Amino acid sequence: SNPDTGTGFPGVSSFSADGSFATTSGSAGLSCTVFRPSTLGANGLKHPIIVWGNGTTASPSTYSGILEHWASHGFVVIAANTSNAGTGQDMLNCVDYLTTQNNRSTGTYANKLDLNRIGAAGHSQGGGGTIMAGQDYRIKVTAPFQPYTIGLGHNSSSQSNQNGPMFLMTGSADTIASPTLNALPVYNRANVPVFWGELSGASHFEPVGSAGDFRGPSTAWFRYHLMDDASAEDTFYGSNCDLCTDNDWDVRRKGIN
């Protein structure tokens, strides 16, 4: 038996493998898709939320592996349907949707959600959208996967106006959202703690589907910040953090030791 998280959720033996929760997916109104535990609210718990923004041209289903993976850990994961998530607006609309649905008398989400534990994540233009959305006071932490910030609705003003800590992921072989042009400015302008991991040899497609080597670390990040999972702290924090000592990763950290 792994120790429970600080917010009362089950502990896990692997961040890269499925959690304990059976999952389902479906519409969350006309503008969003949800991946979530089939049963919400066991043990009187309220579920944290991850909001997702798709890459350019993509749909929620492009990332169904990663999104259902987080759902299996206990997260209610809501994806904006749009293939152009760059302004962050569609993603923040997801928070509005879940807020409404949580505050209803009855419904799937009625008094089942922890609105104080919302994070955001996305790929490419959706990673840019994550940074745009990450300015909002309701977004506690972000995880942009290979963000595209040099066009497609991005406003670089957002980068110095983040609400909470960022786990910036890039691939060193990403030629679509080149990290020098797209991620280095984000890191430099950030007003919050930033953990930047650049996965060695990773292309722009690594985040697709089950998100490959980004899956485990992104799960650790949200479990740490949204679930107070102590066991995840050592992935990011301390001099010899797991990412820091793993040669697959090139790490830069700002406001984190």
Side-chain angles (χ1 to χ4, degrees), residues 4-10 42-48 73 75 114 116-117 222-230:
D4 284 354
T5 75
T7 59
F9 273 83
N43 301 327
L45 298 176
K46 309 311 181 189
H47 294 266
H73 285 254
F75 292 102
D114 194 340
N116 295 131
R117 298 215 174 219
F222 284 129
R223 288 181 67 86
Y224 182 66
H225 288 289
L226 301 182
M227 296 184 163
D228 298 345
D229 181 347

Side-chain angles (χ1 to χ4, degrees), residues 198-217:
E198 181 149 295
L199 180 60
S200 184
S203 76
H204 196 64
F205 294 88
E206 185 83 7
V208 176
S210 285
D213 288 340
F214 296 116
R215 182 173 69 258

Side-chain angles (χ1 to χ4, degrees), residues 230-243:
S231 74
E233 188 173 275
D234 282 352
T235 295
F236 303 97
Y237 293 95
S239 47
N240 296 296
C241 88
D242 294 348
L243 286 164

Side-chain angles (χ1 to χ4, degrees), residues 48-167:
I49 297 163
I50 303 167
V51 179
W52 173 265
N54 306 308
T56 311
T57 78
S59 65
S61 62
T62 308
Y63 303 96
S64 61
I66 184 55
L67 305 178
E68 199 163 24
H69 171 83
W70 291 327
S72 77
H73 285 254
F75 292 102
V76 166
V77 181
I78 187 170
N81 285 348
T82 181
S83 80
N84 293 303
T87 71
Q89 193 190 351
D90 286 292
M91 286 174 71
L92 288 180
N93 287 347
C94 297
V95 176
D96 294 315
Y97 175 88
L98 285 184
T99 298
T100 295
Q101 297 294 316
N102 191 62
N103 298 343
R104 293 292 204 239
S105 319
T106 56
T108 299
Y109 301 105
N111 192 39
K112 292 299 169 81
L113 304 185
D114 194 340
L115 300 178
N116 295 131
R117 298 215 174 219
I118 309 180
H123 187 215
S124 200
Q125 184 192 162
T130 287
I131 292 159
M132 294 287 285
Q135 299 179 89
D136 187 283
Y137 78 98
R138 297 168 293 172
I139 308 297
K140 297 291 190 286
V141 290
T142 64
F145 292 68
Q146 304 174 329
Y148 183 87
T149 60
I150 64 176
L152 297 180
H154 192 74
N155 191 329
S156 62
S157 287
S158 65
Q159 301 169 13
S160 51
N161 192 48
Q162 293 299 295
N163 186 61
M166 175 182 301
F167 174 30

